Paper text:
From an in vitro translation reaction of the MifM stalling construct in B. subtilis lysates, we purified disomes from a sucrose density gradient. A tenfold excess of MutS2 protein was added to the disomes and the reaction was incubated in the presence of AMP-PNP. We observe two major classes of collided disomes: one with only mRNA density in the interribosomal space and another with an additional density next to the mRNA (B and EV3). The latter class also contains additional density next to uS10 on both the stalled and the collided ribosomes. By local refinement of the experimental data and rigid body-fitting of a model of MutS2 generated in Alphafold2, we identified these extra densities as the SMR and KOW domains, respectively. On the stalled ribosome, the SMR domain interacts with uS11 and uS7, as does SmrB; on the collided ribosome, the SMR domain is positioned next to uS3. The two KOW domains bind to ribosome protein uS10 in a manner that is highly similar to the KOW domain of NusG, an E. coli protein involved in transcription-translation coupling. The KOW domain on the stalled ribosome is part of the second MutS2 in the homodimer whose other domains are not resolved. Here, only in disomes where both ribosomes adopt a non-rotated (or classical) conformation do we find density corresponding to the SMR domain, despite the presence of collided disomes in other states in our dataset. In contrast, in the Cerullo structure, the collided ribosome appears in a rotated (or hybrid) conformation. In addition, there are differences in the ribosome proteins present at the disome interface: bS21 is missing in the stalled ribosome in our structure where it was previously observed, and uS2 is clearly present on both the stalled and collided ribosomes in our structure, although it was previously missing from the stalled ribosome.
In B. subtilis, the related protein MutS2 was recently implicated in ribosome rescue. Here we show that MutS2 is recruited to collisions by its SMR and KOW domains, and we reveal the interaction of these domains with collided ribosomes by cryo-EM. Using a combination of in vivo and in vitro approaches, we show that MutS2 uses its ABC ATPase activity to split ribosomes, targeting the nascent peptide for degradation through the ribosome quality control pathway. However, unlike SmrB, which cleaves mRNA in E. coli, we see no evidence that MutS2 mediates mRNA cleavage or promotes ribosome rescue by tmRNA.
Residue numbers in the entry:
A (entry chain s): 2 to 91
B (entry chain 2): 1 to 44
C (entry chain Z): 2 to 273
Amino acid sequence: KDPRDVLKRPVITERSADLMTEKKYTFEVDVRANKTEVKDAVESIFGVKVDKVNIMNYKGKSKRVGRYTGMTSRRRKAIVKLTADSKEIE
Amino acid sequence: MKRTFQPNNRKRSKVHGFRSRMSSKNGRLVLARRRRKGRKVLSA
Amino acid sequence: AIKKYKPTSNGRRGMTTSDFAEITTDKPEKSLLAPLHKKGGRNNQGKLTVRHQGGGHKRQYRVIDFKRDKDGIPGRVATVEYDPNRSANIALINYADGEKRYILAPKGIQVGTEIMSGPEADIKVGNALPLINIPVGTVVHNIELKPGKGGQLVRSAGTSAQVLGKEGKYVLVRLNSGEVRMILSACRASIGQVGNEQHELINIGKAGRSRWKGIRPTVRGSVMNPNDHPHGGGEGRAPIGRKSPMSPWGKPTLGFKTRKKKNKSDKFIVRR
RNA sequence: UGAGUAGCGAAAGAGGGGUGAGAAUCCCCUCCACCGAAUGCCUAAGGUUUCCUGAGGAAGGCUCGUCCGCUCAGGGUUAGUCGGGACCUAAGCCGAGGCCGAAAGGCGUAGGCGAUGGACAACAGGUUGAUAUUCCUGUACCACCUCCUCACCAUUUGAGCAAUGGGGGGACGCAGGAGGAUAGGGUAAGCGCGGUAUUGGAUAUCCGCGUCCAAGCAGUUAGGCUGGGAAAUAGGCAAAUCCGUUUCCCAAAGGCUGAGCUGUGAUGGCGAGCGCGAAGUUCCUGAUUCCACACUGCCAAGAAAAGCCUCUAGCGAGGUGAGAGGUGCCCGUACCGCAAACCGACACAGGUAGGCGAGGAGAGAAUCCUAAGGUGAUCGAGAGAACUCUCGUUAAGGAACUCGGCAAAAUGACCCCGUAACUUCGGGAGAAGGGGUGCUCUGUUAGGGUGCAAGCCCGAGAGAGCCGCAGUGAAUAGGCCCAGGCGACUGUUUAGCAAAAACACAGGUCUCUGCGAAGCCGUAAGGCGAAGUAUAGGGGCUGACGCCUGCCCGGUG
RNA sequence: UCUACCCAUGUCCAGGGUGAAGUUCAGGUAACACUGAAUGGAGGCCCGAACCCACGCACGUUGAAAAGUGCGGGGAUGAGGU
């Protein structure tokens, strides 16, 4: 399990932009990953000390276009609080 | 009017579940003929 | 030890109970309890095979020593206890070595007396001997058939049997109901009379009390329907027009013997 | 077609502004009205995005709709401590070997699964539109780990560790009544802030509002439960210092538990009120909650296992204690949850397990009006005919209608007084049926509780007087009596026509069964009967209690 | 998953009456019976909310509802409801 595949994408929202100021970041991570290797991955790949990680996952929202009634993909969101005096991220 | 149906996911799965069907002999035929018919929702 | 409730409500109109002076304690010894969940007349596959049963007050089993195997160790008895499994009452007797045991409390037993169980024990109330040592014409209880199996034959409240004589490998003993039997001479019985002699005279007043004891209602065959009992049916209250009265499953049920006539034990029963 | 007819699904809105093409229906404001042991506040099963923001109004909405539980685009659920997992077991299920069976398979030992139970460490303030014991703030606690620190023991006459093995515990029922304490309430006194009015009067014992704070840490306690020591050891599969059983000696100490109360936790927060922020005490009342199944009584005699303590068997050269520094995973977490999101085909007068559930009068969670809080209920307005339905009064008579007092009317609360025939002596009995009930003074009545007092609260009585036709001035809480069949009684039944004289019943009787009981399910293994033993189980019949239960065995069994 | 029965384990029942059995006191007796108070708190006990049931009437009967609503009723510490 390479760390680079654990973190899929970030999320850009009003609340994400909020948490950026107080040094809490948001990441879409692998569904199977747990609270530990996400921490280890962010540490390894950004070289930044981290304080705490909180994980929460959404169900797949149902949607309808035209005549078809599929289901959106499931999501597992991650919140990472970085320690004080640490480097930021792009 | 406590009507004839009362939903309970635990019991629904425990009786009509795929495990419960696969366990017994007759459930295997039930799944077999459902698959033969080609039903989408194979088991409860 | 039988008292009457003065009729205050209508339920207690006819009522008797047994005050528990014969009992000496209320809390049992934790060690000898065992779990017991009431089956309620249901077989292993779940079907019902015993009518008129189920739904009593929950009870905990106390393992009784029916074998009396431990021989020669002087036993002291200090309790008489209530036990809701069988009519009789039991006694927790503690031995010299230091392990305790339960025993059917016999009539005339009191806290503090001694107990012996060897094949040379003195003959008093509470002692147990192999029948060969027992002398003729002495009341006895808690008899068994196969030696070492433990007493089976006289165990309910106030029940007793009398030894009518020894004649060889077996012995002649008069069980309750008087049907004298031939029994092996190497079996161990308990001398005396079972000590709850007044249990018969109870007058259960309420239906609810029988239900507490765990006896379901019994419906007559007559008021059934034709398909569900050989008596059911008929307009009005009908007499049973089926020659012999019959059981729910077809057999007659008045005055005819039922024990498979070829069985081996019969040759010992027939002493009579 | 019926036909622009029935229906538009219990209910109070009124008005002024706003938006808008269009407004009874959407938004804001002011009154008014409804629930308030709920129509309130949390939380299950369950629903699965319906939750929030911004847009739209074809369809859904029994009307309209600019509106939303509809459509479209975005957004939203953060846990070492909450619930469930890596902890335990009940019923039941599965089941290696096996037992049985034409085949499939049935049964079941070892063993495992299985909460609705047991054990188990975080709480009170803040915060946005959606989350919050999860995010932030201050204080904590739990399990484990050591690059580290100090205090100590011995590195075999071994320090330390402790078992998937014993033993103790966990460990249990129902009802009743004391006591102790606390939620909670009263605003009684005091305190702080604001106000003194225009309708006749009120700087006055005048009006409105508020009047507190954990978990943890250290003490203390109402209390409850406990006797303690010494020697021995036919037992607890092996051990024994543990447990148990004996014998000798002292008799209150010591021990375990303990709601709560004290300080700190609080130099902080919250706090009426215009980002700041006053006072923040005492008194009175007081539990459906806790001490606590603690005590008493009763019989119907009231789970298991692991967590935990302890005993050795055993391991043992490095460990113990405390600091300091760290680690702590998975799933749930949005929203409705007495409702328009659940179950009833519906935005349906139905049903939906738990916790909290205030004030005035009161015994009360009843009754009526109200608090926090929520709601005005999805078709309207205007005529005020019949007829139908739900209600309110009716002169005189009063059950004359009627199959039948069906329905309706009448009594109803509390305190005094008297209560019959019969009776199984309990009952019958709230029998019947009479009297009083308001308000003021004598009174901060005797007297009682509370407290050192001050004060607060409870209030038997009488004696004077004052009112109205009417004093439990409303809401709501027995109609009664005499006889008789049937059934002793409480209870149960034809969900969805029939709740009864039918069923059951305790009691009685007959009969079967000597225990691999009989009887019953199954073919059989297996069971129930029963870890029960003729004072017990099965079956037939009758049905409290009192007096009794006659003759016939020719026939059928 | 409705319903009948049963097993395991939890949970609910505002408030007020009656007053059993025993027990203490006093008398009573040689002693025992017994008599009167006090205490006591039992009942498939009584009245009555939640809860459950469904006896009467009316309405409804192409209903709000494929069995209900409104006003009265029965049980309400038990064979209880859930």
